[PDB]
Symmetry: C2
Subunit: 360 residues, 2 copies
């Protein structure tokens, strides 16, 4: 079976790497505003519907092609989504929108065992993102893999809190602590990147794009073989868990010092090593349209002792080296601007290993 991955660290054999081509700035709607820093709100307001800066995209394209060359050198088979113009305006009976990109396979695809799952998504500009990946998925399906598409939401107004009182990220953090997010519990929705795998146990967070119904759908669909746990953090990342709590080995996890886990004691009791990475050194003047500087810890493990890490982030490279983990440095400074690091730009399709429990 070409598809087989139970965790984030077993020896990597095949991976899907996103594309930066034709990425479009999403219209500035309520859910986009709730998942981005205010510094960029006017950019979205103005550039909405247009391509991200083409000079910047060209650099990202170059960085990602090099990343793929390195992956191939490290013995990994690389598949890429189909090139698509994301500027096309589509219209469902519930809304109309232009697209985003197919830069982050981690946001839409998650592999659990021999099954590839397409997440529903929660942004109107990402409704048809799955189209870029169908050629690959059908190929794996023809080769024996299980293929699942979680229920696609209508993304009607009822799914969003149109009047979400966010005027700054600080407001968002407070609302979030109150259990208030831009997405309601109207219908299931989730981004696959809000889930992180550790064999029989999968961890998820309720975020601005992943609601409890979405998590419950995953929990119910995967039981009894897998257990989906809900964890939460202080001042959480609006969307996606991999730059907050990145599991890098059996019983080893990188925990973002700025977003501590409320359930950290569950992990300590299981005898897990919680590593807090050093701060990112990325320039504050560098544009990060989505996500934050913590992309430095959004690493991808080639195996337990080999990590693909940002070439510029020396301090975290040192941390890994002191732990006896070989650093494969790759520069994706411009690709970072699109909202992701190594874990985000990929979806591990096949890792060599079996299903096991690490929480004991």
């Amino acid at each position: 079976c070409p598809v087989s991955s139970y965790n984030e660290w077993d020896p990597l054999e095949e991976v899907i790497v996103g594309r930066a081509e034709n990425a479009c700035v999403p219209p500035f709607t309520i859910e986009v505003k709730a998942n981005t820093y205010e510094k960029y709100w006017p950019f979205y307001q103005k550039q909405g519907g247009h391509y991200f800066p083409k000079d910047h995209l060209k650099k990202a394209v170059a960085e990602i092609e090099e990343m793929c060359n390195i992956l191939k050198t490290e013995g990994v088979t690389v598949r890429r989504p189909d090139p698509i113009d994301w500027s096309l305006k589509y219209k469902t009976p519930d809304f109309e929108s232009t697209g985003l990109y197919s830069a982050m396979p981690r946001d839409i695809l998650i592999v659990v065992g021999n099954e590839i799952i397409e997440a529903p998504m929660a942004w109107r500009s990402r409704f048809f993102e799955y189209r870029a990946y169908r050629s690959i998925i059908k190929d794996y399906f023809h080769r024996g893999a299980k293929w699942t598409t979680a229920p696609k939401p209508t993304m009607a107004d009822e799914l969003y809190n149109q009047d979400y009182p966010i005027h700054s990220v600080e407001d968002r953090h407070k609302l979030a602590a109150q259990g208030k997010f831009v997405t309601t519990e109207f219908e299931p929705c989730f981004d696959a990147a809000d889930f992180i795998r550790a064999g029989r146990d999968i961890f998820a967070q309720r975020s601005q794009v992943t609601n409890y119904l979405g998590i419950e759908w995953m929990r119910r669909h995967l039981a009894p073989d897998y257990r989906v746990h809900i964890i939460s953090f202080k001042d959480p990342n609006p969307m996606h868990i991999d730059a907050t709590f990145n599991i890098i080995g059996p019983g080893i996890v990188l925990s973002n010092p700025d977003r501590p886990c409320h359930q950290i004691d569950l992990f300590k009791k299981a005898g897990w090593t919680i590593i807090t990475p050093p701060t990112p050194i990325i320039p504050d003047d560098h544009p990060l349209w989505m996500s934050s500087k913590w992309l430095s810890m959004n690493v991808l493990m080639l195996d337990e002792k080999r990590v693909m890490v940002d070439a510029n982030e020396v301090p975290i490279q040192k941390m890994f080296e002191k732990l006896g983990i070989t650093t494969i440095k790759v520069n994706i400074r411009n690709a970072n601007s699109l909202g992701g690091g190594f874990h985000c730009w990929t979806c591990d399709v096949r890792r060599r290993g079996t299903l096991q429990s690490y929480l004991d």
Copy 2:
């Protein structure tokens, strides 16, 4: 669990009944042409995109409301889809179209055990048909049911044989015998009504709307608990199996005399009683925009000894009575025009009984 149905005959407790409101004539595209009699091709050519005759719809509405009253009298809980204007024109990145209706729950939903499955569909005018049923499905999901949506096709040109050489139904029957259908094997597609359930065994046919990839997806998704078998017939119904091979009890099936099953011997060997119903008496001048006169055998079983049958079709009523099966006669002559009989207009959500094998 509100959802629990393993076959077509156990004591019925809850059912979804379609709506005739706002039904629109689908644009006359290649897949519509391949699933309709030539007599009506000019109607589709002219009325495409407009509402079906409103005077006719009004009569169908009345007939269906009465059917629901009767179901309630027979102790069955009835749920109905949400009223929606099907004339809305939508646009995906692959095509643009107006909708059809939510008259036939059997075409889009199938219940296997405690799981409700939304079929992908194969017609561009039925891409967003699932929207009418989400309120119901979310309610069952909240109440514990498993919910699955098979992979939604792009329905791009590649899925269809644009030059399907059909000039008459006779041509279609020949092509079909050659294994040539309007849909290719480009991506999975299927209508749930091409499947019929008998406990651990589910039977399906490759039709103009259900391809082998679609059947394989179902087979792979349901294994190992259920076995999906592929059967075929002479001069088959272009879409849907329930007016061709309608299983009405443990080891009892109605087999359309005009469309004999190529694998009938498998059933004889299992000791199944194959009943061939008498011919339909419906007037040839009555408009049947979709399907055929064989809607008479498209019965719905309330239990092994109670069948909901067309009030006008006396000959088949007699056949059931001689078999000791109580006939609940309901007139849906005008609703028939939309393309379905009792089995088509409903989706059995809950029947009282357990999972069993009848093929031995």
